[PDB]
Amino acid sequence: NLLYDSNGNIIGFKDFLTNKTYTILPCYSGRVSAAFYQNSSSPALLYRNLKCSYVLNNISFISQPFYFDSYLGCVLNAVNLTSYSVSSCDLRMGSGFCIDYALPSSPYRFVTFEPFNVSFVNDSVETVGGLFEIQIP
Amino acid sequence: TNFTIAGHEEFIQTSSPKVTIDCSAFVCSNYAACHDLLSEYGTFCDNINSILNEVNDLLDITQLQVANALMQGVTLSSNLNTNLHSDVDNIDFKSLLGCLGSQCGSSSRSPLEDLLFNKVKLSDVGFVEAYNNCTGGSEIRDLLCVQSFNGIKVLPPILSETQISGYTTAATVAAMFPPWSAAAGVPFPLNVQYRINGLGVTMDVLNKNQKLIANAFNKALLSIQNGFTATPSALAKIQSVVNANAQALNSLLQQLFNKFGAISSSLQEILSRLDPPEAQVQIDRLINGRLTALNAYVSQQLSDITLIKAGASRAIEKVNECVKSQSPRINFCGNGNHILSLVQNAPYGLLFIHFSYKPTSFKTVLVSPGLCLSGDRGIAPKQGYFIKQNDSWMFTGSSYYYPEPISDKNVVFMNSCSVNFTKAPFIYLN
Amino acid sequence: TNFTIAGHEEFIQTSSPKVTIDCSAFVCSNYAACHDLLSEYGTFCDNI
Amino acid sequence: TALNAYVSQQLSDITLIKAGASRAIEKVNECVKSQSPRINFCGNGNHIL
Amino acid sequence: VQSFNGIKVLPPILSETQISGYTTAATVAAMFPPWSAAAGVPFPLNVQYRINGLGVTMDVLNKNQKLIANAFNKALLSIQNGFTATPSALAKIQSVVN
Amino acid sequence: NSILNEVNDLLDITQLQVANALMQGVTLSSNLNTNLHSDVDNIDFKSLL
Ligand SMILES: *[C@@H]1O[C@H](CO)[C@@H](O)[C@H](O)[C@H]1NC(C)=O
Ligand SMILES: *[C@@H]1O[C@H](CO)[C@@H](O)[C@H](O)[C@H]1NC(C)=O
Ligand SMILES: *[C@@H]1O[C@H](CO)[C@@H](O)[C@H](O)[C@H]1NC(C)=O
Ligand SMILES: *[C@@H]1O[C@H](CO)[C@@H](O)[C@H](O)[C@H]1NC(C)=O
Ligand SMILES: *[C@@H]1O[C@H](CO)[C@@H](O)[C@H](O)[C@H]1NC(C)=O
């Protein structure tokens, strides 16, 4: 009447009453990452690997006006400004993302993180009949 | 007498999975009485989080040093990041080139790198999608999210694999197009001729054999890709990193099922069969035992993270001396005769492709170490020897049999003869 | 004006004696009452 | 606990040996089997063989 | 005594006999043809190029070849004799075992 | 107390290795410098001495 596995875990159950089989799955007991600046009213929350629907319904009973689902999970108290890039980030969240604070909408901006770039030149790449364009100092 | 070009792969590990563990949820899941005894070890929990955060800071600073070397003095053209063509001078390099710029989709990895990430399931994007598709759905019995609910979670690195692949791509373009910011400003076909010339090969034999050298790089690059079907030494080291980290996480998770010999292994049945006066002793022996496992786990991370920086430092020195420039050091980049080396992105490290000068035929010939002319003169060859054909002394290379007339460029000048210098008062020089 | 040739020495450590330790011989050699308690830990010994 | 303290010291001891072993390999390839143009690396200033 | 308690030292893969044979081949490869350890340069002739790198007139080294050969003999005997009274390198080798 | 001794001994040996490279093959004259002879090639190097 009980299904188990190699590492001593219960993953099955059969009922003594009418024959209905079920399974046992763990429950969510994770944490939340908060980005706090030097001086601010409230930090920006980040529920990793959680959709905004599951957060505002099961684990959170309060109402949050600002919510945004990102690649890393649902982001609270922040704006979606991924089109802007920075190079001096101080709150790194991974996967090439950043959170910037701008004093006066939430003051936290969810932007990318590009610490290195290539110096481009307006010269051509195709030869002109055996000659190349080189920027000599 | 006859030579060719060979290939060789090399994998250097420069990264490691970032594991973060909490003190409360690992020992005391949700029991309120359990946290009462843990409050007496508040300073002990603060030291565990500080050690894990210290290890994560070392992986973040080393990853920036890898991107810094690949993005050091790199210059590209404006009308280049528009999905241009490839195969410059009959040298096929489309396998080592990804998205030319940012005018593509989400994936911008080269076709050669795709064969590596497809054989590794627990990559950077693998842990993200695994933790997402386990909150409900159909099947959630995977051991990856079971550790997440118990306090064992792996965080992604700062720079994603897409940005790292874009950095390695710019290093390859910088050595194939003007202004050639990866070869001190020399053309790619011309740079290969100078590398072979330094080994003792004549310069004129490289011009007439341009088609043989061009087809050699194409055959070597196509041969290094077909070898991924089997299990090479490079793929074996990549598969060992993910298996070693998975064993450590499963071994630490097994500590939650150890009874530690107090009354049992689980805390729920302790509070249901023992009174509070005698339950404090049974729980205290579980907390002391579980905290010992966490203290021993964080100690192994400090010892393992040191060897990662040791191997990563060699990769940094190799890129700045074998890929971004031509270092005069010998037996450093490859094995003996070395010509060129390239870098490619790899899961949890980098992949290097080394090209070497491999002869095929040989020929025995009598050579002389040195000789002197008449009048107490003296000369000696460099990167070559002295051979005598049809009763006439001529110069030859040290890696290719090609008789050359003795001139003032391939020999040095002295002021006296030696004891083992053959006398030959027939050569005239000015 | 005048020169000669000198010579020095240098030693660099490369290897080290390989030591192997087991659980059933260091904690208790052949005590049956101790092996029943030491084996209760399980993975705590296998990591060594 | 004594066994955990011994393996912790053994992991730190082999790391210094691994770093010293890599230095010996460079001397074999760049000072013994070859004459690298590096100065103050193989010996002390004026170096021959 | 430590062996009966579970502390035993195992020998490595390659013995000292095979390691000593590898070092011998490296020394021979720099004295006889094809001089695999000197880039095809004879041993007495390669020394003149190494000294010339510091900057010296090659006419002196070519004339004083006899003084150079006798100088290396004194250096080798000095190292061999120094390994008897109080060696500086052997003092650190004992610290590895201790 | 033993491990802390070997840790401090490694820092003492490393301290001598850094000082050895700074004084490896250094020759100076009798007429010295540092408020005796300075300002070479109109370059102010007093702040570095
Ligand atoms: C469940 O299946 C068994 C199999 O024969 C049967 O004997 C039993 O009656 C079933 N349960 C019920 C409630 O009918
Ligand atoms: C955030 O903005 C980017 C760019 O404007 C867009 O591609 C993305 O879908 C946005 N995220 C949302 C709407 O959740
Ligand atoms: C070298 O080998 C290739 C292929 O085997 C052959 O085509 C070529 O003629 C050879 N060269 C010489 C000089 O024998
Ligand atoms: C140099 O010293 C050696 C040994 O003392 C001596 O034999 C030789 O004559 C000296 N040469 C000169 C030029 O003084
Ligand atoms: C060059 O000569 C000028 C004028 O004599 C002098 O001021 C300067 O110091 C000299 N530069 C040197 C000696 O490097």
CB atoms inside a 10 Å sphere around CB E24? 9
CB atoms inside a 10 Å sphere around CB D5? 11
- What is the rounded distance in angstroms from the CA atom of residue B26 to the CA atom of residue B43? 16
Name the method of structure determination: cryo-EM
Q: Verify whether ligand 5 is closer than 6 Å to residue F2 (CB atom).
A: no
Residue B164, CA distances (Å) to A114, B34, B241 in order: 11, 45, 19
- What is the rounded distance in angstroms from the CA atom of residue F12 to the CA atom of residue F6? 10
Nearest ligand for residue E63 CA: 4
State which amino acid sits at residue B199.
Answer: L
Q: Are B3 and B359 in contact (CB under 8 A)?
A: yes
Bridge partners, residue B387, by sequence:
B394
**Beta sheet of B379-381, edge-to-edge order:** B411-413, B379-381, B371-372, B422-423
Cβ A92–B158 below 8 Å, yes or no? Answer: yes
Cα dihedral A93/A95/A96/A100 (nearest 10)? -20
Residue F18 tokens, joined: 């850094």
Residue B158 tokens, joined: 């700062």
- What is the rounded distance in angstroms from the CA atom of residue B407 to the CA atom of residue B73? 40
Q: Are B310 and D18 in contact (CB under 8 A)?
A: yes
Angle at the Cα of E54 (from E50 to E59), degrees rounded to 5?
75
Q: Which of C37, C46, C47 sits opposite B261 (nearest CB)?
A: C37
Residue A60 tokens, joined: 């959170």
Angle at the Cα of B87 (from B84 to B89), degrees rounded to 5?
120
Name the residue of B1, B2, B215 whose CB sits within 8 Å of the most ligand 3 atoms, as the mutation to test its pocket: B2
**Beta sheet of A2-4, edge-to-edge order:** A2-4, A10-14, A21-22
**Interface probe with A: pick from B21, B75, B100, most Cβ of A within 10 Å:** B75
Hunting for tokens 């905290």 — which residue is that?
B291
Cβ B299–D4 below 8 Å, yes or no? Answer: yes
User: In terms of residues, how long is chain A?
Assistant: 137
Element (H, E) at A109: strand A108-112
Helices (H), B319-416: none
The closest of B312, B367, B370, B412 to B11, measured between CA atoms, is B312
Q: Verify whether ligand 5 is closer than 6 Å to residue F42 (CB atom).
A: yes
Smallest CA–CA distance from B144 into chain A, residue:
A26
Which residues of chain E have a CB within 8 Å of the CB of D46? 54
Phi first, then psi, for residue E77 (nearest 5°) are -70, -30
Query: How is chain F classified by DSSP, letter by letter?
Result: -HHHHHHHHHHHHHHHHHHHHHTSS----SS--SSSS--GGG---GGG-
User: What is the crossing angle of helices B233-253 and B276-318, to 10°?
Assistant: 160
- What is the rounded distance in angstroms from the CA atom of residue B340 to the CA atom of residue B182? 12
CB atoms inside a 10 Å sphere around CB B2? 11
Which residues of chain D have a CB within 8 Å of the CB of C48? 3-4, 7
- What is the rounded distance in angstroms from the CA atom of residue B212 to the CA atom of residue B402? 18
Residue A17, CA distances (Å) to A14, A25, B213, B254 in order: 9, 22, 79, 34
- What is the rounded distance in angstroms from the CA atom of residue D30 to the CA atom of residue D36? 5
- What is the rounded distance in angstroms from the CA atom of residue B188 to the CA atom of residue B168? 17
Angle at the Cα of B172 (from B166 to B174), degrees rounded to 5?
105
Hunting for tokens 């979606």 — which residue is that?
A80
The closest of B305, B307, B265, B303 to B282, measured between CA atoms, is B265
CA atoms within 13 A on the CB side of A88: 1
- What is the rounded distance in angstroms from the CA atom of residue B234 to the CA atom of residue B56? 26
Q: Are B161 and B124 in contact (CB under 8 A)?
A: yes
Which residues of chain C have a CB within 8 Å of the CB of E93? 11
Angle at the Cα of B177 (from B181 to B100), degrees rounded to 5?
100
